[PDB]
Amino acid sequence: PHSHPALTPEQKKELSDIAHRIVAPGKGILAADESTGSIAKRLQSIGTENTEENRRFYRQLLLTADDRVNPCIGGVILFHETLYQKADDGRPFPQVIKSKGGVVGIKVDKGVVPLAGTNGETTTQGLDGLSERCAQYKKDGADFAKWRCVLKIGEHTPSALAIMENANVLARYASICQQNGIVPIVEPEILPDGDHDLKRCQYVTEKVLAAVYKALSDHHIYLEGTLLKPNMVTPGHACTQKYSHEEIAMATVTALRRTVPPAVTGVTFLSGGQSEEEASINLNAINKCPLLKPWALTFSYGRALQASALKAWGGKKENLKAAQEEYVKRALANSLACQGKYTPSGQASLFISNHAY
């Protein structure tokens, strides 16, 4: 019942200013922190050798895109390797990002691990020596971090243990980051896997976020100096029920309104397996939802921002300009979407077909 200030006013101000810059109006986050393993599948899809130089060139392609993307990107999440690479212009990627008005982020978790005694559930590791790592990343230009927990909707999941443990680890991570001037993005991702309906996802999302924010409070986390990266509320991928974008937005905003304190500076949605256009349309609808939203509602996309760029590139040096522009276009689209001003002019499914029966 006695206070022991974890942070001073100067520290809080620093953290709050960083969080606000990341989600300033019209700005979102580019998630380019895919591990050497995940990026491998990316480069492989375009018949490109998984070399360190190719990963560097690809990240360069995105990070050095035309300045027209500057207003759209408030932050860029990098993987350890990329944090220490340099662009062709000689400057280290962190400096490139900052020069374009973006804040630098770094993935710090070390993957999911299985929770014994559960039906395939997990928690996430990476707390060991995290303070020292954060202190070094700070010195090297990083101002925010990323830690991802994974929860699954199933017959008996997420279980009480999985919800409590993941919420607790997210809080530990958040505490360590704030002690080192790093804004922590809390990511309690609930997978869309399964045939559950929209209501089931909303319910689980509500219980999970409630546990998350209780945990953050128990660990004395400064909410204004954090961001939340949740899953949008949607039906399971194998759901046989059709929903409109307005329903997904309503369910998503409702869940958030019932669990996320107004103090949280911003929500940066993950898009899961949504297509580039789908992720933008849903983000727009969320921002147009006729309910009061006390926090910024923007994006933190990887695939939804890179799909077309990766394809247009194809590993060919000549396709550089064309490729970058593909990313620039999705960035511009989401910049509008996160402001509820994305409504393309013009007119306006396997598990829905009879084959799902």
Partner: peptide, 4 residues
């Protein structure tokens, strides 16, 4: 993986 976060892409799929």
């Amino acid at each position: 993986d976060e892409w799929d």
